[PDB]
Amino acid sequence: MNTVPFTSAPIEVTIGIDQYSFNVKENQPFHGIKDIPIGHVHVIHFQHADNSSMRYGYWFDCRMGNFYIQYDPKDGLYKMMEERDGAKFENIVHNFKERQMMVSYPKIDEDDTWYNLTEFVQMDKIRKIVRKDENQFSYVDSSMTTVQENELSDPAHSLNYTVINFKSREAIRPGHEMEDFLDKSYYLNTVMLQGIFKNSSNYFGELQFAFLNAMFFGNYGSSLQWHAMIELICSSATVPKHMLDKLDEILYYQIKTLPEQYSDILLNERVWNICLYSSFQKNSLHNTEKIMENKYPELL
Amino acid sequence: GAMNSSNYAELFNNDIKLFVDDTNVYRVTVHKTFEGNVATKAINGCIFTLNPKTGHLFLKIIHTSVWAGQKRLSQLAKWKTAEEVSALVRSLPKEEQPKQIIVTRKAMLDPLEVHMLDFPNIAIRPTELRLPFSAAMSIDKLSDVVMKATEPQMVLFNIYDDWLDRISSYTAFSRLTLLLRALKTNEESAKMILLSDPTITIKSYHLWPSFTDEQWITIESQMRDLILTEYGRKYNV
Structure with a gap:
């Protein structure tokens, strides 16, 4: 089970993780998504409360690196980034989990929906459709x-x-x-x-x-x-x-x-x-x- | 886009264009069988490919042998039309190739587009005009070459005879569409009007009679009267 921590949530936003979604309030003490199933691609997606135009998000596979989200107040969006320091990353996740500041990927045991929607989807093929070779994850938006x-x-x-x-x-x-x-x-x-x-x-x-x-x-x-x-x-x-x-x-x-x-x-x-x-x-x-x-x- | 009453003068500008009419490509007689079922017998047909500026007609005769052992003939007829128009374009020198092909029936658009993929700069257009080119087989010399054909054949005609010596291509096209609309509405009456005076003949090298300018005005009036009469009957108005 992998984790995508969030530095913070400075703007009110609806956050999607695969077929699930959660509303986060402006400056709500939200620090990410845990218990993400290993073995599939995933998508973490955003729709801001103040501009419900430009849905945007990131395709990723936690087997390929340690990823986190951080809001950029200049470009005005939540950005995915890779943490190259494994020990810094493990220490961040452990702290946020201990403080229960993370939502749990809400998968029902019986429920194969995500597998059924992503059975043939591979991160290496996504990265050829969405070309940004310096990142291991892929940005997509509405436009x-x-x-x-x-x-x-x-x-x-x-x-x-x-x-x-x-x-x-x-x-x-x-x-x-x-x-x-x-x-x-x-x-x-x-x-x-x-x-x-x-x-x-x-x-x-x-x-x-x-x-x-x-x-x-x-x-x-x-x-x-x-x-x-x-x-x-x-x-x-x-x-x-x-x-x-x-x-x-x-x-x-x-x-x-x-x-x-x-x-x-x-x-x-x-x-x-x-x-x-x-x-x-x-x-x-x-x-x-x-x-x-x-x-x-x-x-x- | 579509050729209509709004962009009608475009037909007579200096951009080479052809009308393609596939109405008469697949022609049948429907009959009873010995067992009392119904069957069709194909007869020879033709593609009607016309330059409306010059009157040049490329009459590709479709011999009944092309249908032998084929299925879905009304579908195949559209593709065979598009194949033969594509072959005609490829046979023309580059400076004679059309810049546009206007199909009289919308069902010809996809077949012709697919056969003309090698010519991306030739526009394939529909028309909102209701053109009477189905009546081409009421022109005796055209009907005669189609029925006599024993193999696939292309025959070239000028559908305007020598009219362009005296009238513009706009006026020639209007005369042709009036003659064909009359022949389509009441063939017997139209043919009577065209041959009633035995002193006016058809030249060996022509399709229509050798009318003087004044005789053409009388004929054109007789054709318009024929079309309105018939119309009042069709609709009881």
């Missing part, structure tokens, strides 16, 4: 644009998701125009899986990361990438059976976790109607079709 959104403006602040474009020479073999447009199996299996991602685990990791950035930060380009990666599988007639079964599990937990009140902005009607009712895979996503029909029958 960051994707490489694809930028092509259609600060490159160093971009989300480098894999570009997917159904009307591109990458997607369409000369001489197989109708075939490749109506059946995206060559684009999925040869270009994306064999070519770029190398395996289905890396593809699913990026799909899961995109979803979580959409949900936690309202990051619109992330939502676009999540839907594009769903549509590319559902629009392929030839998909390995293990990938279809895994996608149904992935999407079921994403739809299960989504706040009911955000379905209007986070779910694309066209993609979901096409994927569940028209696509090659309309009959391959039983779990996802059942939770979507019971939770969001209006969208469909």
Whole structure:
């Protein structure tokens, strides 16, 4: 069980840790989050009480270093930092724990939600989508644009998701125009899986990361990438059976976790109607079709 | 974006552009089988590809052999159209290639865009205009070359005959759309109007009769009367 201490909380803020959230008052004696499960990535995220715009946060893995949060009054945000002195860090955490100044990661024993949402998500892949090589953790916010959104403006602040474009020479073999447009199996299996991602685990990791950035930060380009990666599988007639079964599990937990009140902005009607009712895979996503029909029958 | 009544003069500027009409690509007769089921029999079709400034018509004849053993023919017909338009563009010298292709039916946009990926600077546009190019097969010489074809063939025409010697491309296009709208609304009546006077003939090298400027005014009036009559019937107004 690892710990992310906070130096202090000088401004009133709603703090998220994965799917959980806590309100902290201005100058409340709050000194961090303990009992964080080892084995998963995590995200610690912020929404200020005085400006509920710019949700922002940090992806990290406590196996990769000792991380803490400290408010910067110049840049006006909570920043993640790495403590390189192990003994200073252990001494800070032990003191804050003894004074019970830390919230406990509130995981129910039965509850695999976080594992199910991050099964394929690896910190090393996050650090290639979010490029800031001097840190072992990754900053994301509501406003960051994707490489694809930028092509259609600060490159160093971009989300480098894999570009997917159904009307591109990458997607369409000369001489197989109708075939490749109506059946995206060559684009999925040869270009994306064999070519770029190398395996289905890396593809699913990026799909899961995109979803979580959409949900936690309202990051619109992330939502676009999540839907594009769903549509590319559902629009392929030839998909390995293990990938279809895994996608149904992935999407079921994403739809299960989504706040009911955000379905209007986070779910694309066209993609979901096409994927569940028209696509090659309309009959391959039983779990996802059942939770979507019971939770969001209006969208469909 | 979309070509409409607002941006109509753009058709006659000096930017090369083509209209593509796929209406007559996949043509069938529907009939009963011996067992009393229904079946289709394909007949030869054509792509109607028109430069509205010059009148140059690229009539690609679609021979029934291209459908043999294929499924979902109304879908395939759009892709085959886009394949043949792409092949036509690639066959033209660079200085003759269009800067825009206007499709008469929105269902042609994705097929044509995908086949033209190699030409990112050629704009593929829809139109809000309701153009009567489906009636091309009411022009006897066009219908005759399509029906006689025994293999895929491209035939080149000038759909304006020699009109551009006397009138602008705006006026020529308006005359063509009026003739085709009349032929579409009441083919028998339109053809009667065009051949009623036996002294006015069609030149071997032309599609339409050799009307004088005054005869064209009389003809155009007769076509407008035909269209309004028919309209009052369609809607009881």
